């Protein structure tokens, strides 16, 4: 019978308020806790539990997510044993049936619709520079990759720094001194070999002294 008690008393208190009751301060304060207890009953008729989806592995709330995780990768996934980035532009395909005589074609993106049909399925890509497949990149030796990149980074930074600058100073990147070339395209092509190995070693001291001056 809490319904008839809460309603009638609230009216009497309200009527007492308009008549300036002497005890209205205490009588209303006790009714607030009386209504709050009555309020939870109505809140029970409204709310219906807590709920969450349960994880079978851990029988609490399910926290499994497809979110991203960092998982630092080996450096061989980026640069080859010579130090140049991989270009996954060649698409390798494998036949769905062994009876197919070719069973593998390596074609560029444009040639795919010309030469590939439903009888084949895509396989892992190949780098057009170092000819390694994508799923076999682990075969590349990391310590050889790192030492090649450190020479590639050193030579690239050297020539990037000396893109216009000369190790002996004064631009002169046509022929003079050793600013640009010792013949051929040795200053950008980097695969003629032993020309960068000598010239960079010729002015290695210059590279060391300029980097620290910049880093100040």
């Amino acid at each position: 019978k809490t319904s008839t008690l809460i309603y009638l008393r609230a009216y009497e208190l309200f009527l007492k308020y308009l008549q300036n009751a002497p005890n209205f301060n205490s009588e209303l304060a006790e009714f607030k806790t009386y209504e709050n207890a009555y309020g939870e009953q109505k809140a029970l008729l409204a709310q219906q539990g807590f709920y969450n989806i349960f994880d079978p592995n851990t029988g609490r709330a399910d926290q499994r997510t497809r979110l991203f995780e960092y998982k630092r990768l080996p450096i061989s996934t980026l640069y080859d044993e010579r130090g140049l980035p991989h270009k996954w532009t060649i698409y390798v395909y494998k036949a769905v049936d062994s009876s197919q005589k070719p069973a593998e074609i390596e074609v560029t993106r444009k040639d795919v619709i010309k030469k590939i049909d439903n009888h084949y399925a895509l396989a892992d890509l190949r780098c057009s520079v170092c000819h390694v497949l994508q799923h076999e990149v682990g075969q590349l030796n990391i310590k050889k990759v790192q030492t090649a990149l450190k020479a590639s980074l050193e030579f690239n930074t050297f020539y990037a720094f000396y893109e216009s600058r000369c190790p002996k100073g004064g631009l002169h990147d046509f022929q003079d001194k050793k600013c640009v070339k010792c013949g051929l395209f040795t200053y950008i092509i980097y695969d003629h070999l032993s020309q960068p190995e000598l010239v960079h070693d010729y002015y290695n001291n210059y590279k060391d002294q300029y980097d620290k001056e910049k880093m100040s």
Partner: protein
């Protein structure tokens, strides 16, 4: 009443019993009357056009109903747009409205010289589904009864099916030919369905990747945004307008629209939460691609730690370091490989909408499925605005991780984290601000340009 030079309401004309010559009668608008249809802001020449009134006798309808392909004239959509409509009553205005301001004159854009209207959304994908070679069930054919049903609502004179038995199968390209025959044109172009970025994955049907129409006979290929899309210069509707006038182009837009829509009334089209869900193997490859990006970013950072960053002449080290990073966190073209591995293109609703040009693009598919990537505001990363060297309270001062500067690693379907959402909201609000600036900024320029040039 010319005899009285006065206007009488219709309740007090019981003694009239007739109208005399010279009287003017103000009669209710009927179907076939011309009406002016206008959306504000009226920015383009097509912003006011004349439509043939179709009075809707249902008293429960109070909206202005228009074909969807007509919205390209007014830049309108049905998200709550209101457009003015006034029916000319003067004979001079009525003669003018149908002869000069009819929407058939705005089919070709004055701005671009190309067509304005075409198939949009439901029909751009509907035209592709109707005209594709193979359905997942098999060859894309229909019996005589369902080929006839494609022409029920076209409002044109239906073709002849007397040569087809009830058990005869009609190709999807067959029925389109019997509609394109009335306005025979020559069209040969690669469809939007065939894309280089998709080709290494998915097996394109050779009868779908070359849309050729000879004298109104669709003899190969699919019909998509390139052929039937709105605003597609050189499309089939642009060619129909050139040979047979813009009015025939509008009729063939509607006839082809009903043909496509009636096909999807049996083929059915949908998008599901699994259409945007990657396989666990592909999701393991998307992470591998992203870790490769973050590895390159950390390789740049390791150069910065050892002082190996030598900026080019004219750029500061910070400017060069930021320039290097923005190149490091660019999604490679191979990010489509995991997406296409998890997609059945014949049945994937999301892919077909994107690949056929109905709606969306490759970034939308990549963002939903693969990853958001770097967040760029004015062609640069998120600036450290929280404090000196801090981008957010969630990241340390002078943090070098790419995530601190807006690089979002998750995809939309995976669910962004709290700081990824904040960076996304910075880009999201920055797009909302640009829109509001665009309306006001162009308003001043448009009015200045009008007055300088109007004379």
């Amino acid at each position: 009443k010319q005899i009285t030079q006065s206007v009488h309401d219709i309740e007090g004309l019981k003694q009239d019993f007739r109208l005399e010559v010279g009287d003017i009668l103000y009669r209710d608008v009927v179907t076939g009357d011309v009406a002016f249809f206008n959306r504000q802001p009226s920015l383009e020449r097509s912003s006011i056009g004349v439509h043939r009134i179709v009075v809707l006798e249902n008293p429960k309808i109070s909206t202005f109903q228009m074909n969807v392909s007509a919205c390209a004239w007014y830049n309108a959509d049905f998200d709550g747009d209101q457009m003015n409509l006034w029916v000319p009553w003067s004979v001079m205005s009525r003669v003018e409205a149908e002869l000069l301001c009819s929407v058939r004159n705005w089919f070709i854009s004055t701005k671009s010289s190309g067509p304005v209207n075409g198939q949009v959304q439901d029909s751009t994908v509907g035209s592709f589904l109707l005209t594709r070679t193979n359905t997942p069930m098999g060859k894309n054919v229909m019996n005589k009864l369902h080929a006839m049903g494609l022409f029920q609502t076209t409002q044109t004179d239906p073709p002849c099916f007397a040569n087809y038995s009830p058990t005869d199968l009609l190709d999807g390209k067959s029925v389109v030919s019997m509609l394109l025959r009335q306005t025979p044109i020559n069209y040969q172009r690669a469809p939007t369905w065939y894309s280089e970025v998709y080709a290494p994955y998915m097996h394109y049907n050779k009868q779908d990747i070359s849309t050729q129409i000879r004298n109104g006979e669709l003899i190969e290929g699919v019909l998509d945004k390139k052929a039937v899309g709105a605003g597609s210069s050189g499309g089939i509707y642009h060619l129909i307008s050139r040979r047979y006038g813009p009015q025939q182009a509008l009729k063939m837009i509607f006839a082809t629209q009903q043909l496509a829509l009636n096909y999807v009334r049996n083929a059915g089209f949908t998008v599901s939460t699994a259409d945007m869900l990657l396989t666990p193997e592909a999701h393991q490859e998307v992470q591998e691609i992203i870790n490769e990006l973050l590895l390159e970013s950390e390789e740049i950072n390791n150069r910065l730690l050892h002082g190996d960053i030598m900026p080019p002449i004219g750029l500061t080290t910070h400017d060069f370091y930021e320039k290097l990073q923005l190149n490091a966190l660019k999604f490679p073209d191979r990010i489509l490989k995991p997406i296409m591995n998890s997609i059945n293109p014949e049945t994937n609703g999301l892919f077909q909408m994107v690949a056929t040009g109905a709606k969306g693009s490759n970034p939308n598919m990549i963002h939903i499925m693969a990853g958001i990537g770097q967040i760029e505001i004015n062609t640069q990363r998120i600036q450290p605005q929280f404090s000196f060297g801090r981008t957010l309270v969630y990241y340390p001062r002078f943090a070098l991780e790419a995530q601190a500067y807006g690089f979002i690693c998750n995809s939309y379907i995976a669910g962004l984290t709290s700081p990824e959402f904040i960076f996304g909201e910075m880009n999201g609000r920055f797009d909302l601000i640009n829109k509001a600036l665009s309306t006001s900024s162009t308003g001043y320029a448009n009015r200045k340009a009008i007055f300088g040039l109007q004379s």
